Each structure stands twice: as structure tokens, then as C-alpha cells.
Scaffold this active site. Structure first.
Site, PDB file in Angstrom:
ATOM      1  N   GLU B  36       0.720  -1.290  -0.019  1.00 25.62           N
ATOM      2  CA  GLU B  36      -0.025   0.017  -0.047  1.00 25.62           C
ATOM      3  C   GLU B  36       0.954   1.096  -0.031  1.00 25.62           C
ATOM      4  OE1 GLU B  36      -2.920  -0.440   3.225  1.00 25.62           O
ATOM      5  OE2 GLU B  36      -3.025  -2.461   2.615  1.00 25.62           O
ATOM      6  N   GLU B  84      -2.637  -7.669  -3.468  1.00 25.87           N
ATOM      7  CA  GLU B  84      -1.882  -6.360  -3.265  1.00 25.87           C
ATOM      8  C   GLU B  84      -0.425  -6.477  -3.413  1.00 25.87           C
ATOM      9  OE1 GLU B  84      -2.823  -3.884   0.235  1.00 25.87           O
ATOM     10  OE2 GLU B  84      -4.631  -5.166   0.343  1.00 25.87           O
ATOM     11  N   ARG B 118     -11.043  -8.426   0.010  1.00 22.55           N
ATOM     12  CA  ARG B 118     -11.524  -7.436   1.139  1.00 22.55           C
ATOM     13  C   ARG B 118     -11.997  -5.996   0.550  1.00 22.55           C
ATOM     14  NH1 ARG B 118      -6.264  -5.431   4.759  1.00 22.55           N
ATOM     15  NH2 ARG B 118      -5.222  -4.435   3.127  1.00 22.55           N
ATOM     16  N   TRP B 160      -9.508   3.238  16.204  1.00 22.95           N
ATOM     17  CA  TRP B 160      -8.537   2.555  14.768  1.00 22.95           C
ATOM     18  C   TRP B 160      -9.525   2.928  13.621  1.00 22.95           C
ATOM     19  CZ3 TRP B 160      -9.350  -0.803  18.766  1.00 22.95           C
ATOM     20  CH2 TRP B 160     -10.298  -1.784  18.566  1.00 22.95           C
ATOM     21  N   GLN B 253      -0.721   2.765  10.653  1.00 22.80           N
ATOM     22  CA  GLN B 253      -0.543   2.679   8.925  1.00 22.80           C
ATOM     23  C   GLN B 253      -1.858   3.089   8.472  1.00 22.80           C
ATOM     24  OE1 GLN B 253      -1.805   0.281   6.753  1.00 22.80           O
ATOM     25  NE2 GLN B 253      -0.958   1.304   4.994  1.00 22.80           N
ATOM     26  N   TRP B 303       5.211   0.185  25.122  1.00 23.88           N
ATOM     27  CA  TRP B 303       5.082  -1.045  25.533  1.00 23.88           C
ATOM     28  C   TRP B 303       6.052  -2.064  25.781  1.00 23.88           C
ATOM     29  CZ3 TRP B 303       0.954  -3.291  27.277  1.00 23.88           C
ATOM     30  CH2 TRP B 303       0.719  -4.765  27.177  1.00 23.88           C
ATOM     31  N   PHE B 356       0.891   3.546  23.058  1.00 30.51           N
ATOM     32  CA  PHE B 356       1.419   2.355  22.748  1.00 30.51           C
ATOM     33  C   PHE B 356       2.850   2.990  22.020  1.00 30.51           C
ATOM     34  CE2 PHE B 356       1.837  -0.974  19.234  1.00 30.51           C
ATOM     35  CZ  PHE B 356       2.351  -1.778  20.048  1.00 30.51           C
ATOM     36  N   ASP B 365      -3.961   4.204  25.820  1.00 33.05           N
ATOM     37  CA  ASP B 365      -4.734   2.926  25.712  1.00 33.05           C
ATOM     38  C   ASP B 365      -4.532   2.470  27.215  1.00 33.05           C
ATOM     39  OD1 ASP B 365      -1.914   2.087  24.546  1.00 33.05           O
ATOM     40  OD2 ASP B 365      -2.793   0.238  25.419  1.00 33.05           O
ATOM     41  N   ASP B 367      -4.202  -0.957  28.317  1.00 31.40           N
ATOM     42  CA  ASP B 367      -3.162  -1.883  28.368  1.00 31.40           C
ATOM     43  C   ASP B 367      -1.879  -1.180  28.700  1.00 31.40           C
ATOM     44  OD1 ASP B 367      -2.355  -4.599  28.270  1.00 31.40           O
ATOM     45  OD2 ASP B 367      -3.390  -5.096  26.594  1.00 31.40           O
ATOM     46  N   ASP B 368      -1.318  -0.228  27.741  1.00 28.29           N
ATOM     47  CA  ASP B 368      -0.150   0.249  28.020  1.00 28.29           C
ATOM     48  C   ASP B 368      -0.089   1.108  29.360  1.00 28.29           C
ATOM     49  OD1 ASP B 368       2.049   0.435  25.676  1.00 28.29           O
ATOM     50  OD2 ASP B 368       0.234   0.794  24.573  1.00 28.29           O
ATOM     51  N   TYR B 411      -9.265   1.423  23.979  1.00 27.66           N
ATOM     52  CA  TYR B 411      -9.319   2.926  24.084  1.00 27.66           C
ATOM     53  C   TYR B 411     -10.470   3.677  24.460  1.00 27.66           C
ATOM     54  CZ  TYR B 411      -5.147   1.886  21.024  1.00 27.66           C
ATOM     55  OH  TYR B 411      -4.119   1.517  20.404  1.00 27.66           O
ATOM     56  N   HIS B 442      -4.641  -7.609  33.016  1.00 28.14           N
ATOM     57  CA  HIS B 442      -3.231  -6.641  33.215  1.00 28.14           C
ATOM     58  C   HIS B 442      -3.671  -5.652  34.144  1.00 28.14           C
ATOM     59  CE1 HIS B 442      -1.768  -7.852  28.823  1.00 28.14           C
ATOM     60  NE2 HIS B 442      -1.651  -8.890  29.861  1.00 28.14           N
ATOM     61  N   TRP B 480      -5.468  -9.614  22.395  1.00 30.19           N
ATOM     62  CA  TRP B 480      -4.450  -9.007  21.992  1.00 30.19           C
ATOM     63  C   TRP B 480      -3.192  -9.808  21.953  1.00 30.19           C
ATOM     64  CZ3 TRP B 480      -5.375  -4.331  19.274  1.00 30.19           C
ATOM     65  CH2 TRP B 480      -6.418  -3.950  19.651  1.00 30.19           C
ATOM     66  N   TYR B 486      -1.969 -17.219  25.934  1.00 35.01           N
ATOM     67  CA  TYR B 486      -1.856 -15.661  26.411  1.00 35.01           C
ATOM     68  C   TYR B 486      -2.919 -15.223  27.323  1.00 35.01           C
ATOM     69  CZ  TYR B 486      -1.748 -10.810  25.934  1.00 35.01           C
ATOM     70  OH  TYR B 486      -1.905  -9.339  25.855  1.00 35.01           O
ATOM     71  N   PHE B 592      -6.161  -8.574  15.013  1.00 36.71           N
ATOM     72  CA  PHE B 592      -7.747  -8.607  14.748  1.00 36.71           C
ATOM     73  C   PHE B 592      -7.787 -10.066  14.791  1.00 36.71           C
ATOM     74  CE2 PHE B 592      -7.639  -4.283  12.290  1.00 36.71           C
ATOM     75  CZ  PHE B 592      -8.157  -3.801  13.679  1.00 36.71           C
ATOM     76  N   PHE B 596      -5.810 -10.053  11.217  1.00 33.23           N
ATOM     77  CA  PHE B 596      -4.515  -9.335  11.007  1.00 33.23           C
ATOM     78  C   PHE B 596      -3.841  -9.744  12.468  1.00 33.23           C
ATOM     79  CE2 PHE B 596      -1.923  -5.300  12.005  1.00 33.23           C
ATOM     80  CZ  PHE B 596      -1.362  -5.738  10.784  1.00 33.23           C
ATOM     81  N   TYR B 600       5.623  -9.575  17.933  1.00 37.54           N
ATOM     82  CA  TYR B 600       6.255  -8.770  18.586  1.00 37.54           C
ATOM     83  C   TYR B 600       7.587  -9.284  18.855  1.00 37.54           C
ATOM     84  CZ  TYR B 600       1.615  -6.361  19.706  1.00 37.54           C
ATOM     85  OH  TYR B 600       0.538  -5.605  19.755  1.00 37.54           O
TER      86      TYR B 600
END
Ligand SMILES: C=CCN(C)CCCCCCOc1ccc2c(-c3ccc(Br)cc3)nn(C)c2c1
Ligand SMILES: C=CCN(C)CCCCCCOc1ccc2c(-c3ccc(Br)cc3)nn(C)c2c1
Ligand SMILES: CCCCCCCCOCCOCCOCCOCCO
Ligand SMILES: CCCCCCCCOCCOCCOCCOCCO
Lengths: 619, 619
Positions: B36, B84, B118, B160, B253, B303, B356, B365, B367-368, B411, B442, B480, B486, B592, B596, B600
Site C-alpha cells: 500500500e 496487493e 476485502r 482505529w 498505518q 509497550w 503505545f 490505551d 493496556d499500556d 481505548y 493486566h 491482543w 496468552y 484482529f 490481522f 512482537y
């Protein structure tokens, strides 16, 4: 004879030209720029002791014996200026004892103290907590809700005033205070017995606005103000959309400084707009050889470049001179191709103008556009496609800017409202941008280069305009240049270019007027006092630029081969320096008749060259 | 025994720490980012042949034998991604012949071609003129007029998705086309006989939106659309006001790329926001040793830093370790102190969260924030005033974020609308930000460090939340992070921290579940397929991170001194590298579920250390 003067002057201009191919001389004003900057720093809490030093030297350096500061070199002491400079110094360190401070403090008191300063000065002082906000003319955020065709909508104001208001509304909306350390509190600005001689609105004050203001200060006290939040955001958004590319706002000191404050107010110090606006400042600053530092009210790259080119071409250099091409090319990259605030009145007009500074797309001006388009019209660039194209785009933009009366304003069309000139807040400079004789003259002089004569209606409507404005003595007011010598020179020069008969009655009545003011030394000079006192029309110490101006009127009027004519030429030839330059310890540029004056650094070199170049054509 | 593994691991993390005192590992995703980007460049007309190269190597390097690209290493070939990547390569230079192209082209065709991609993919292709705009789900600018409490107002979407929509409305409003040179036209993406298997809305599509869309594409054809201008400007302003500090938009992005395009559309390429937004890109890019170049979906400085600290502290290092102070201090400078979009629901809540990435003030957020606040809570910094103060601001912010169900979103609060999940446009990833088990865990684990047990109502409301979410097999979903290993690890670890009895029935039912999935090699692994096929819950190749996770659940549940427990410890101790690090050719991060996935980079090093550090506490 005069030739050598040229060759020297020419080689001088070319030596000042930058690499990129443009010219850019500093723009001098007064010390309120640097003083307000100091306060701005204090506000934003970003004080650099090293800068404060360079700034203190400057301020002192610009202080006269009496211990005051004026608006122009050799001008009457200004209260506002001196007050601000005073506070500035005291903040930097100076003690109210130091002789310099003493003299100033006395002048300030002998005038009625702070209570006699312009709105702005009092406002700034208000921002640091040295003056009550209640006594400051109120400008509400809600002003953002006025439609395009309503009383006092932001588009009834001149471009420069507009942004200033928008920014301020947000500020006056919160009426924030940033306490000065006790060490610099200035209560002594109050200690006075003299009556507080206050300045009123520009064109008078109607009890209406006077009441309205009182109303606003009252409403400002309520606990809840409906839709105020929306008013503010509207203002903020208006600002974010128009921020110039260099991070400034309009490429001018006022709105730029306020916008930043306003953003600080909204906790957006960590927002791109703010960051960029902050760092962009350095570009307007200037290091002084004697250690001082000054901040420019604006910058004239484009303007200087355009003139320099015309001067050198009128001088002699070939239309395809490789040095004049760097300029031409550079100018082409400058042309603005997007809708600015001007589009609000001319939605169907295609972009094609130029701006005074480097990157200010939303505010191109007619003066700059006319000079640039005309300058290019005298060059033979490599890409005849873009040169041909650009000139046409600019040309049509200028034509589409002509106001009702056939004259030309600087930024907008028919921005001639009168309402703004009566507001309690507007007690400094101009607030509207109506058509002027000088801008118009440059425009005609431009079309004339292409050949368009008096036959074309657009030209006629303009000539008639000028004809109706000409002063009783056959002189022409100088809006953006000090003064009648500036205007008259422009007009006569232009009228000669559009085909008009240089023998006409009103024409001759103008040339006579010129010869009649030629100083003994053979040159011409007009002091900035000519805006305040009529007895100074065409009176003042001769300067290189002003001489060249009166000179152009004579060369254009046909009296080139005259006594007074050859007389002036002698002046320039003699007063010239060894390097080929010229000096000019006086301001010949006008920002706001009677309120703000400018010192154009290139004038002393460009115009004399242009004047001579044309006298060389007359032979 | 294991000791040496720690010492090695510890010194390793300390070696990866940057000078400023923070940690920051790259974030891996898939090749749609880079693809992209290539199109973005083409759009903005800013193509750097040298970059295109580095990008080509990357693309090819990430292509598998079959000639496809997946969402995660060792995952099923993805159509969208591959499509793509295909177009991208063909633009860079590749000919439809080249074997790499051939294999991909066929995969694409065997799936039904472009008609099966998509929305996004089709939209991008639409932008370059390789797909009809009419066939693209419409999102109108007017959406900007929906009130705070109305159906489908921009605040019913997750953070997002929100910005993405706002940006796009402006784009879809103009439906611009930026022609690709013939050389790269890709009609072959159509050449297919297979039926176009189209993906529908996330949670289903009601005939309503389906018709509504048709309505829009029709209205989009009229000659006049009232107030559309006002709708667009509302969007533009919304974007200008929220642009992140690094010139991005949310530090992600998607919206970032669209905003830029939208600005280009409005001829604002010479506006600060655009400029800054453009140059901001380089920061997310990454030079690959093999000559390739990749663009990060986002960046995890904060993070990574937060975790690294907790890992090292749980490991052994002193709370006042000079190296851990650099971090602590750095983190304190990061805390956001201004209202973000979250304030729309909590107007009386005081700012105190963290983001983040480096500079993203409007989107901190939970979490962070939780990890950071908790990480600080384990340090002894020089300025105990700011450490004490900060922790307090963050603590209260987190509390004021707890949604209705006692759970915690990422968020926003109660951003649980369902309307958005049915729009024709939303056929990829999540579109809303409802509370999740992992984020919540957390949070509790955080408060637990301060001491706040089950007695406090806030904790109870949360525990009850989790208790109601626990899966039948006693496992916990991983929102996440991939996946049940996890989540479960997080939950059990947290519940143990808030005082809950580790002997409880539902608790034990969770630990058993863990031990039951321990791979033969002594470790634990969960493939990303566990989101698509339930048969993969807790199944997959063992990884350093995922092992440490299941390990934490056991250590926390009391079964620290178990077989499966000591078994796993053995795995980590062995698989460790000579430098003290660890490898992980698999993704353990979730963007996601099923759409997605993320990789890490620090997980492989941080978590194993944290796991061991706690196993060392259990003895
Ligand atoms: C012929 C050249 C082209 N010409 C076209 C541009 C030259 C003018 C730019 C320099 C003047 O800059 C300003 C421009 C505006 C202001 C104000 C001001 C006054 C009243 C309000 Br209300 C707001 C601002 N104060 N001050 C010092 C100002 C200085
Ligand atoms: C546990 C860590 C803290 N956590 C809290 C942040 C981690 C998430 C940030 C990385 C994911 O960034 C995104 C975030 C959003 C998107 C979208 C997307 C999807 C649907 C719509 Br509608 C708009 C955009 N596409 N893609 C690749 C995206 C990538
Ligand atoms: C321009 C008005 C400033 C007042 C807004 C701050 C109060 C919080 O408003 C609630 C929601 O807005 C939060 C969004 O942050 C976005 C940036 O827009 C800039 C000014 O807040
Ligand atoms: C949002 C409309 C985009 C369409 C472009 C036409 C631009 C017309 O703008 C109205 C005229 O006002 C000009 C003011 O300067 C602001 C520019 O804002 C930039 C994008 O419109």
C-alpha cells in the site's frame, strides 16, 4: 558619465543575489517586534538567556538619547513602542534605576502612563498580569458565526487584521494570565499625574460599539456561555486550515504570535501546528554584527527579487542573462496555484498570484503578483512554456481582482467596509484593504508591458480611478511607500506605460509638483511625518530610493532631459558608495500611514539602479 | 541450574536497551503495509527508485514457494495480501511472466480474482483506476453530522476505525483516480472462471445497509449535494485537530495513509499537516540487512519498555538500578496529560494514561497505561514526587475507564455498539472496542501490585466479568495475543495478584487445561489458526513467549513446583541462545482475531525472562 555608477550598481546587486537566484533584504520596523517576542517566550515558557542578551543589546542600541524609541529613524518618540521596550528590558534584567530605564520611565509618565497606550500594548500587559482584562476591548469567539454577508464577519476585515482577530477571540475568550516574577512587575507604568490621553477607534467611535463592548465584558462574566465552545473550535479550525507553510500565519508577526499563544491556551503545545509554528520563528530572526538580534515583521524575498530583476533589465543585462534566469526560474516555482481567502469573493477565478514571502499560499497579493508577472515578461527563460503559461495565469488573476472602482486592493476585492474601523479594539493601523493608487499604478505599469493600452476598458476604469484620486497639488498619496514622491512616481510612470498622453494637464501638474520639491543637494526626500503633518509633503532629507522615484516620474513625463532631472542624476552618481551601493538611514516604506513604518533594505540599491537604467534609455 | 539462563537473558535485554533508556523492538505484520506504501507513493507522485528496490527484495523475500503471502509465518495463503503484493511488484517492474508472478496470479485466479478481495484491497485498486468505484462500499462525508448519541456517529466506532472512516469519507466523496502506467495495468486480476466468493460484513449484513449503500452510490451521482462541502470540512478539521505529534494519525498505518491521500485530494500538499505527515513516515520504516525495506503497522516503544522493566525486576535487578532508572524517568516524560477522544464519554476524568507509541496524545490505551503504571510501581526513582504523582494520575484514569460490565476496553469506555459491524464497508478486522479479558487481567494485575484486593468493588465487578467470560474448558480468549495460552496466563496471573484463592474450582480447571496442552518438547505453543479452527486451541509449535505465558499461569496457580512446570522451565533454559536471547519464527501477537496478526520482536526475550524470574521467586 553616470555609466560607471550603473556598472558599479549593477555588479553590486548581482553580488547580493543568493545562490538559489533570488534577492532578500531584511525588513526593518520598530522594537515592538523584539519586545513582544520576549513576552511571547515568557508566555510559552521558553526563555533562552543567550537570546535575551542579543535582544537587550538591540533594544538599547535602538534607544535614542532622550531614552525613547520611535517608529522610524529620526522620528518623534512613540509611547507604545517605548512602553513595550521598557517592560521587555526590565524582564531581561534591567533595574528601574539604570539611567536608560529612568529616562524612558519619565517619558512614559509625562504621557499619562500605560492608560494612554494602544489596545495591543495594554493587552500584552494584560497577558502577563500587569493590566486588568476588563479594560481591554473585547473580541468574542462567537464572531466566528457571522455569515459572509453580515455586519462584521471576519471577511469584512483586511487579511492581516482577520487572522489576528480569529486568533485573539480564542485568547480573549479565556483571558489567561501569565504572572511575571515580582522582580519585573511594572506598577510604575501607572505612577503618573498627567491625564490619560486615550486613543480612540480609527474612523471614530459610535456609542453603539462602545456599549456593545460593555455588554461583552458583562456577558464574559456569566457562568455559562452557550455555544462558546463551538465558537472557539470554529476559530481554531480556521487557524489550522490556514497556517502558512513556514509554520507562520500570513507571514506576519501579529497573528503568528497570537495563534501560538491561543494554541498554548488550548494545551496544543504538543500538536504539529504548534511545533512547526514555533520553530518557524528562527527564519524571521536576524543576527546583528554588533551582537544584537532582531525579528522581522515580515520577509520580502519575492518582492526584492521581482524588483531587482526589473532594475537590472531596465539597467542593461540581456533578457536571457544566465544570472537573471536563476531568478526567473525561481519565481516560476513560487506562483501560488490554490484558492486563498480571496476566493470567498471570486469563486470562479483561477489561482495565479504570488506572495510577498517564501511560502504563503492563502494570501497572494496584487502588488507582488503584478511586479513578478511583469518582471518575467522581460526575461527569456529556457522553458518558454511555463513562462508563457505562468504570466497568463497571473495576468488573469490580477484582472479578476480589480475592485468596483477600477482600482486594486492588496489582498481582497472591494474589501471597503467601514464597520470595522469603529470597533473599540481597532485603534492601530488599517483594518480594511480598500484599493490604493500605488498598487493600481504598478498593475497598469504591468499591463502596459504587454501593450494593453487605454483602449481596453479595464485600463480606462483604472485610469479614471487614479484621475479622481489625484490630490489638489497634482500629487498622489503613497499607501505602501513614503509617500507622495513614491505614489506620484508610480502613477506617472504607469500612465506613461498604458499609452496616456504625457502632455495632459493633470499630468504636467504632477511633474511640476516634483521639480518643486527637489532639495538643494539635487535629490528628493520625503519624511514619514508627511502622513501626520501635510507641511511635510515632499519634504525631508534626500534619499537614494525616493530620489529615484521622483526621477522616474520626470523621465516618464518626458522631462527626462531637464535641469531638475539631470540634477537628481548627479545626486545618485555622487552619493553612491565605492562598492557600487548606496546608503539610506531613513525609512521609505509604509506599513500603516501614521502608525507603522518599514525600512526596505534593497530600495537603496534597486530603485537607484532602475532610475538610472531608464535615464540611460532616455538617451 | 536455570540461573545461568537468566543472567544471560538479563544481560541480553540490558544490551538491547537504547541510550535514552527505553526498549523498542520492530513490529511485524504482513506485506500489505509495504504494498500500500508503494501505491501511496505512486498516488502522491513521490517515487524513489532506490526505495522501490529495497521494497521489491522484501516482497519476494516474504513470498513462499507456492508463490503466495500469508498473514503470519506458516499460515494459509491470503488472497488480499497476495493480490496487493502482486500489483505492487508489477508496478515496481516485475512482468506478469516471471515465475514469482505466474504462481501468484494463478493463486489469485483460483480464488475468484479481485472480486473476492476485502473492501480495502478493491478500494486501493479503485484509487489507481483498476476497479470501479461504484462497486466499493460507500462511506459519505455527511457521516460527520451524526450527533454523539445517534446511530453510526463516528464515536460508535473503535478508535482505529474512526479516524480511518473520517479520512476516507473525504476520499470516497471525490472518488479520485490516479491512473497506473499501461505497463502495470492488471486486468489479469479479472481473468477467472471461478465464482467470486465475496466476504460480507463482520457480524452479518442487514438488507437495510445493503440498500442504504445503493442509495448512496445513487446520490453520489447527482449534480448537487447540499452541505457536502460542510461535511468534508468537518472531516478535514477533525483530522487536523487530531494529527499525532510524529505527523502520523493514531500511530497506525491505515488512517495515516488515507489522511495523506485525502489532503492531496484537497491540494494541501503545501500545508504543514501534510508535510509533517509525509516526513513522519521514515520513522516507521526499517532497513533490512538483506537489502530489503519494511514499514511498521505501528511502533511499540512504550509497550516494550514497560514489559522489559517488569521482566528485569521480576528477574532480580534492584528497584533503583541505575539502568532501570533511565527507563523510569523516560516513562514519566511519556505520560499524556490532555483530553483525548476518550474524554467524549468521560468529560470529568483527569488525563493520566500512556500511549503505545512515542507521541500519540489523543489515544492513550488502558493496556499500556496499566503496564507502565505498574512497572513504575516497582521502581525507586530519584524524584519520588513525580513517580508518586504520575502513578496516581494513571491509576485514577484507569479506574475511570472501567466499562459497564466491569471489564476494560483498550481505548474507549463501553464502545460496544453493534451497528458498525453490519456496514458493507466493514469486512475486515474489528470495528468496535469492547472490553476484553486480557486487557482487564493486566489491569487487575496492576492494582494488585498496590494491594487493592477483592474487597474493593472495582475489583469484584471485574472478577465477576472474567468469571462470566471463562470458556467451557476453563480457558480464556486472547484478544491482543495468540491466544488462549496468552489470555489464560494473564488472567490466572492477575487473579492471583488480586488476592483470589488459587485453589478455587474454576481456577484449577484453568491450570489443568494448561498442563494438558504442553507439547512433548516440554514447551507450549498456540498457532494463529486457533482463531479460525477451535481444534487449534493451545495447539501449535512451542515458542519462547507462549511457553513463558502458560508457565506464568502455573507459577501463579501454585503448581510452580510441578512436573509440567519444571518441564517447561527446561525448554526455555535449553532453547536459549548463546547470547542469552531466544528465537521465535512464529507470531504470538494478535491485531484482529482471524484477520490481522502481529509479530512482537521483544516477546521472545522479555516474557521468557519474566517467567523465569518468577519461577526463581517460587523457590
Ligand atoms: C508592497 C509590498 C507588498 N505588500 C502587500 C506587503 C507589505 C506589508 C507586510 C508588512 C506589514 O506587516 C504587518 C501586518 C499587520 C500588522 C499589524 C496589525 C494591525 C491591526 C490588526 Br487588527 C492586526 C495586525 N501590526 N503590525 C505591526 C503589523 C505588521
Ligand atoms: C497490547 C498492546 C497495546 N495495544 C492496545 C495496541 C496494539 C495494536 C496496534 C497495532 C495494530 O494497528 C492497526 C490498527 C487498525 C488497523 C486496520 C483497520 C481495520 C478496520 C478499519 Br474500519 C480501519 C483500519 N488495519 N490494519 C492493518 C490495522 C492495524
Ligand atoms: C477547541 C476547544 C478546546 C476545548 C476542548 C478541550 C476539552 C475537551 O473536549 C472534549 C472532546 O475533545 C477531545 C479531543 O482532542 C482533539 C483535539 O482537538 C483539539 C482541542 O481539544
Ligand atoms: C473543502 C473543499 C475542498 C474543495 C476545494 C475548493 C476550495 C474552496 O475553499 C473555499 C475558499 O476559501 C479559501 C480558504 O483557504 C482555506 C483552504 O482550506 C483548504 C481546503 O479547502
Amino acid at each position: 558619465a553616470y555609466a560607471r555608477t550603473l556598472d558599479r550598481a549593477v555588479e553590486y546587486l548581482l553580488s547580493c543575489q543568493k545562490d538559489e537566484g533570488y534577492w532578500w533584504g531584511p525588513l526593518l520596523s520598530n522594537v515592538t517586534m523584539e519586545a513582544e517576542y520576549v513576552l511571547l517566550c515568557h508566555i510559552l515558557d521558553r526563555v533562552d538567556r543567550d537570546r535575551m542578551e542579543k535582544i537587550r543589546r538591540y533594544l538599547l542600541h535602538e534607544q535614542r538619547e532622550d531614552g525613547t524609541w520611535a517608529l522610524y529613524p529620526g522620528g518623534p518618540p512613540d509611547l507604545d513602542t517605548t512602553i513595550e521596550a521598557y517592560v521587555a528590558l526590565k524582564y531581561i534584567g534591567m533595574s528601574r534605576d539604570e539611567e536608560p530605564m529612568q529616562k524612558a520611565l519619565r517619558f512614559i509618565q509625562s504621557q499619562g502612563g500605560i492608560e494612554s497606550s494602544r489596545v495591543f500594548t495594554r493587552m500584552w500587559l494584560a497577558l502577563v498580569g500587569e493590566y486588568p482584562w476588563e479594560k481591554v476591548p473585547m473580541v468574542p469567539p462567537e464572531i466566528m458565526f457571522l455569515g459572509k454577508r453580515m455586519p462584521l464577519n471576519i471577511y469584512e476585515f483586511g487579511s492581516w487584521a482577520r487572522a489576528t482577530v480569529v486568533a485573539l477571540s480564542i485568547v480573549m475568550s479565556r483571558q489567561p494570565v501569565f504572572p511575571l516574577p515580582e522582580r519585573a512587575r511594572v506598577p510604575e507604568l501607572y505612577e503618573t499625574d498627567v491625564p490619560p490621553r486615550r486613543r480612540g477607534a480609527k474612523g471614530g467611535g459610535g456609542w453603539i460599539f462602545d456599549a456593545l463592548d460593555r455588554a461583552l465584558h458583562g456577558y464574559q462574566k456569566l457562568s455559562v456561555h452557550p455555544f462558546r465552545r463551538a465558537a472557539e473550535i470554529r476559530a481554531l479550525d480556521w487557524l489550522l486550515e490556514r497556517q502558512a507553510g513556514d509554520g507562520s500565519w500570513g507571514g506576519i508577526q501579529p497573528p503568528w504570535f497570537y495563534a501560538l499563544i491561543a494554541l498554548k491556551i488550548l494545551d496544543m503545545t504538543q500538536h504539529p501546528a504548534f511545533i512547526k509554528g514555533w520553530e518557524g520563528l528562527e527564519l524571521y530572526g536576524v543576527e546583528l554584527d554588533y551582537g544584537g538580534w532582531m525579528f522581522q515583521a515580515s520577509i520580502s524575498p519575492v518582492w526584492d527579487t521581482g524588483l531587482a530583476v526589473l532594475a537590472l533589465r531596465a539597467a542593461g543585462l540581456p533578457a536571457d542573462h544566465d544570472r537573471l534566469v536563476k531568478a526567473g526560474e525561481w519565481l516560476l516555482d513560487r506562483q501560488i496555484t490554490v484558492p486563498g481567502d480571496w476566493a470567498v469573493k471570486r469563486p470562479n477565478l483561477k489561482p495565479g498570484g504570488f506572495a510577498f514571502q517564501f511560502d504563503n499560499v492563502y494570501y497572494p497579493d496584487v502588488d507582488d503578483t503584478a511586479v513578478v508577472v511583469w518582471a518575467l515578461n522581460t526575461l527569456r527563460l529556457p522553458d518558454e512554456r511555463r513562462r508563457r503559461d505562468a504570466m497568463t495565469k497571473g495576468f488573469r488573476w490580477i484582472v479578476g481582482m480589480q475592485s468596483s472602482n477600477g482600482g486594486w486592493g492588496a489582498y481582497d476585492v472591494d474589501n471597503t467596509s467601514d464597520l470595522p474601523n469603529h470597533i473599540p479594539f481597532c485603534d492601530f493601523g488599517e483594518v480594511t484593504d480598500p484599493p490604493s493608487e500605488d498598487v493600481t499604478a504598478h498593475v497598469l505599469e504591468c499591463f502596459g508591458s504587454f501593450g494593453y493600452d487605454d483602449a481596453w476598458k479595464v485600463i480606462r476604469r483604472a485610469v479614471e480611478y487614479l484621475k479622481r484620486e489625484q490630490k489638489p497639488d497634482g500629487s498622489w498619496f503613497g499607501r505602501w511607500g513614503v509617500n507622495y514622491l513614491y505614489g506620484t512616481g508610480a502613477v506617472v510612470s504607469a500612465l506613461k506605460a498604458v499609452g496616456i498622453d504625457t502632455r495632459e494637464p493633470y499630468i504636467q501638474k504632477a511633474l511640476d509638483w516634483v521639480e518643486q520639491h527637489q532639495n538643494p543637494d539635487g535629490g528628493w526626500g520625503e519624511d514619514c511625518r508627511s502622513y501626520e503633518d501635510p507641511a511635510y509633503a515632499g519634504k525631508g532629507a534626500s534619499t537614494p530610493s525616493q530620489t529615484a522615484w521622483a526621477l522616474m516620474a520626470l523621465i516618464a513625463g518626458g522631462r527626462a532631459e531637464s535641469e531638475a532631472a539631470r540634477r537628481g542624476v548627479q545626486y545618485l552618481v555622487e552619493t553612491q558608495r565605492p562598492d557600487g551601493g548606496w546608503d539610506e538611514p531613513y525609512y521609505t516604506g509604509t506599513g500603516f500611514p501614521g502608525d507603522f513604518y518599514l525600512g526596505y533594505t534593497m530600495y537603496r540599491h534597486v530603485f537607484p539602479t532602475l532610475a538610472l537604467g531608464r535615464y540611460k534609455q532616455a538617451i
